[PDB]
Structure 1
């Protein structure tokens, strides 16, 4: 193997990136002034008197998120309109000036506390774009204000798992375009919350860039480093193939994808969209596609102006969670005999329920493969396979075969990348065994789990 391949096959996640990956799916909570004014885009300078939801019940939100199987929640602490959901000391444009809770409330506190009681991690979105704040457009003075608010959020509310950042901007009242001192912002986050992943407009987690309803066929976590300050764009179908990254040499990095979408057409709640909430089945397919396609899933659910998650959203979440649990429960009810093409001693690692142990074929194994034999003919429609990503991402082509009770065997399906998890789906079939052929790989693959199941 050449220097380049030895490099690519060993690019690896940091501690914070690995912990983040293991979350799999978490929620976004869009709630604030835009909810009250029924907008996707706020104008700024909205009257704080308009923020007076009568029945905020964050435990109702968290209850539904747990039932949905979420690992954490990212709250919109301040959106583009600039209204802050905590009583910031740096602006009067906050819940402290609203009639909500007699001006004595702190929704960031209320949410973070409830998240922790519910076993969910807590993250923040603090909008760089600010349509109210006076310093906006002045340059450094707005950076000072932003950093000031980051500091409040990152020091007063306990551990933060993610700081989510988009890059929208505009002109201030002075007519000048505000640009952000990203490097300065990153230092603050790294300093105050070392374990947090800085996401999207940050170096730790990449916006998947997919068209809604689509995920990459091949999602590589190892990609050109230039994608971190985002010729090539985040929306390209092929970011990480050998051909795509060839010319970049060592200028690549571990920069894993996050698929983000809303359960409704809009990010904020609009009553007119109450008949347009994704169903539990739509969410499940999404989960299977994202979390079964080497991407984390960020799912937005917006509370209504009353201060509750709406009934359809709660039901979809509940059904999503039920489908995910049924899937895992069947993935454990599975009785299989695992056999490998080499390193049979390590074959045990495929089924010990330890994500830290893996099977890796011998260097001279020219056809690495895992055979799973079933106690008797069973119907299956998917295989689950996971790489030991702590050590990198390597698999490039996977071919799955099934041995039918009727002597013969056929191809059940193929896939490219695996990474954190590949759930390969196909038509319901009855087999006595399946073989996973790792036809292509950057050096020897390290596989921590393999399984055949019926969804």
Structure 2
């Protein structure tokens, strides 16, 4: 039993599945996919800030007086096939999938009773997107996470609460908390990704009461995990795992379980129709970020943005499928792994360390020119063996009294290596 207070809530141990997953897929999907321009913050940039570029876009592409709510019917999503999405996520090696049920626009991707005529069922897709995707993912043993934004930019009740200094709680009692309760009682989420919390304290959001109910009497109380975005000054301080800032890149090992969320599109989480090839993150960068995150004990959350028709564009599919291809070879060093005592060598070619049981894995992202890999951290005693996942046969290794360990990598012809951006060396009998 837990009580509605942060010292009690923070003592809950994390379910082991989240740590063992190490790789999830983030989906940003909503009405913002209809303009598909600028970012998922289109409504705020256009109306809340009045940026001239967004006003020009609306002037040139839509009749005068066009409002953001008019985007609703245009969110047709007539090519959405959740089974294909789930198959792609499985082929990408993803262990969990986090879908945005509601973003700052306030448009819920499920039939919310408190979001009437502003949900995916009443207008637009005329479907329960959250339920369909959840069914498809549960059929393939993939964990489900629901992204919920606490705030809404232009909701009148939230604006009224903000005008009152958040001394009233009309918005929380009307929309936010009922939506969270409905999202938990149905679709039975494994993960809750909270957002939109930087404007108000946790007392206003009623976060402690909801978290106590979730941990005590919710149907998912046993194996649910939540992030740290539950109010002002709550990041990296309160919650299940720490998301900290977006695209978080710690320099050392954090003392709490964390997760780095990053987007394949460098300038938007939602889909952009005019996205250039340069805006797309390179695959070597994605694999390097995954390796560095997993080596430092964190989870990796890669984001894609579907189109308004419910399709994942071929470039995102290529990136995800190449991630999955690399994982199909180097997953023994990633899934259900733990950070080692070093996790990266000081003077090296960017070698990163993971551990699993008695096995140590050194992932290097740059083939040495001399053809010999230098590992000055490991200590070999009697029965050290080298594997080099994907290549058969134990490699040759030599010890040095002043230097460390030198391993002769197997020279291979071009376009003949199982991986192309990173390689894993497996050492057994190494302390």
Normalising by the smaller structure, the TM-score range is 0.5 to 0.7
Partner of 2:227, secondary structure, is strand
Alignment of 1:203-352 (within 5 A): 203-209=239-245, 212=247, 215-221=249-255, 255-265=256-266, 266-275=268-277, 276-328=279-331, 350=358
Partner of 2:179, secondary structure, is helix
Q: Which moved more, 1:160-169 or 1:88-97?
A: 160-169
Instruction: Choose between structure 1 and 2: higher strand proportion.
Output: 1
Residue of 379, 403, 411 corresponding to 2:404:
411
Q: Figure out how many residues of one structure are paired with residues of the other and give that number.
A: 314
Partner of 1:43, secondary structure, is helix
Q: Does 1:110 align with 2:132?
A: yes
Q: Does 1:183 align with 2:161?
A: no
Residues 329 and 201 of structure 1: CA distance in aligned 2, closer, same or farther (over 3 Å): closer
Residues 409 and 170 of structure 1: CA distance in aligned 2, closer, same or farther (over 3 Å): closer
Deviations along 1:170-205, one digit per CA (max 9) or x if unpaired, are 69xxxxxx9422223323432323221120215111
Residues 379 and 21 of structure 1: CA distance in aligned 2, closer, same or farther (over 3 Å): closer
Residues 33 and 169 of structure 1: CA distance in aligned 2, closer, same or farther (over 3 Å): farther
Where do 5+ consecutive residues of structure 1 fail to align?
A: 1-11, 172-177, 222-254, 333-347, 352-367, 382-401, 413-427, 432-449
Cα pair 2:104 2:196 within 8 Å, conserved:
no
Partner of 2:281, secondary structure, is coil
Residue of 96, 107, 120 corresponding to 2:142:
120
Q: With the length of structure 2 as denominator, give the TM-score of the two structures.
A: 0.64
Report the counterpart of residue 429 of structure 1 in structure 2.
Answer: 407
Cα pair 2:396 2:407 within 8 Å, conserved:
no
Cα pair 1:128 1:169 within 8 Å, conserved:
no
Q: Does 1:46 align with 2:69?
A: yes
The CA distance in 2 between the partners of 1:66 and 1:404, in whole Å, is 37
Report the counterpart of residue 369 of structure 2 in structure 1.
Answer: none
The CA distance in 2 between the partners of 1:331 and 1:79, in whole Å, is 31
Partner of 2:170, secondary structure, is helix
Deviations along 1:345-397, one digit per CA (max 9) or x if unpaired, are xxx9626xxxxxxxxxxxxxxxx96647456xx6969xxxxxxxxxxxxxxxx
Q: Does 1:142 align with 2:171?
A: yes
Deviations along 1:36-89, one digit per CA (max 9) or x if unpaired, are 122421438523213212211222222221111111111100000001111111
Q: Which moved more, 1:135-144 or 1:36-45?
A: 36-45
Residues 372 and 282 of structure 1: CA distance in aligned 2, closer, same or farther (over 3 Å): farther
Report the counterpart of residue 61 of structure 1 in structure 2.
Answer: 85
Cα pair 1:151 1:188 within 8 Å, conserved:
no
Q: Which moved more, 1:112-121 or 1:273-282?
A: 273-282
Q: With the length of structure 1 as denominator, give the TM-score of the two structures.
A: 0.61
Report the counterpart of residue 245 of structure 1 in structure 2.
Answer: none
- Tell me the CA shift for residue 168 of structure 1: 4.1
- Tell me the CA shift for residue 118 of structure 1: 2.0
Where do 5+ consecutive residues of structure 2 fail to align?
A: 1-9, 45-67, 162-167, 231-238, 336-355, 360-377, 390-394, 410-424
Alignment of 1:86-105 (within 5 A): 86-92=110-116, 93-100=118-125, 103=126, 105=127
The CA distance in 2 between the partners of 1:331 and 1:88, in whole Å, is 38
Partner of 1:95, secondary structure, is coil
Cα pair 2:146 2:192 within 8 Å, conserved:
yes
Report the counterpart of residue 228 of structure 1 in structure 2.
Answer: none
- Tell me the CA shift for residue 13 of structure 1: 8.2
Report the counterpart of residue 185 of structure 2 in structure 1.
Answer: 155
Cα pair 2:107 2:115 within 8 Å, conserved:
no
Residues 374 and 110 of structure 1: CA distance in aligned 2, closer, same or farther (over 3 Å): same
Report the counterpart of residue 100 of structure 2 in structure 1.
Answer: 76
Partner of 1:83, secondary structure, is coil
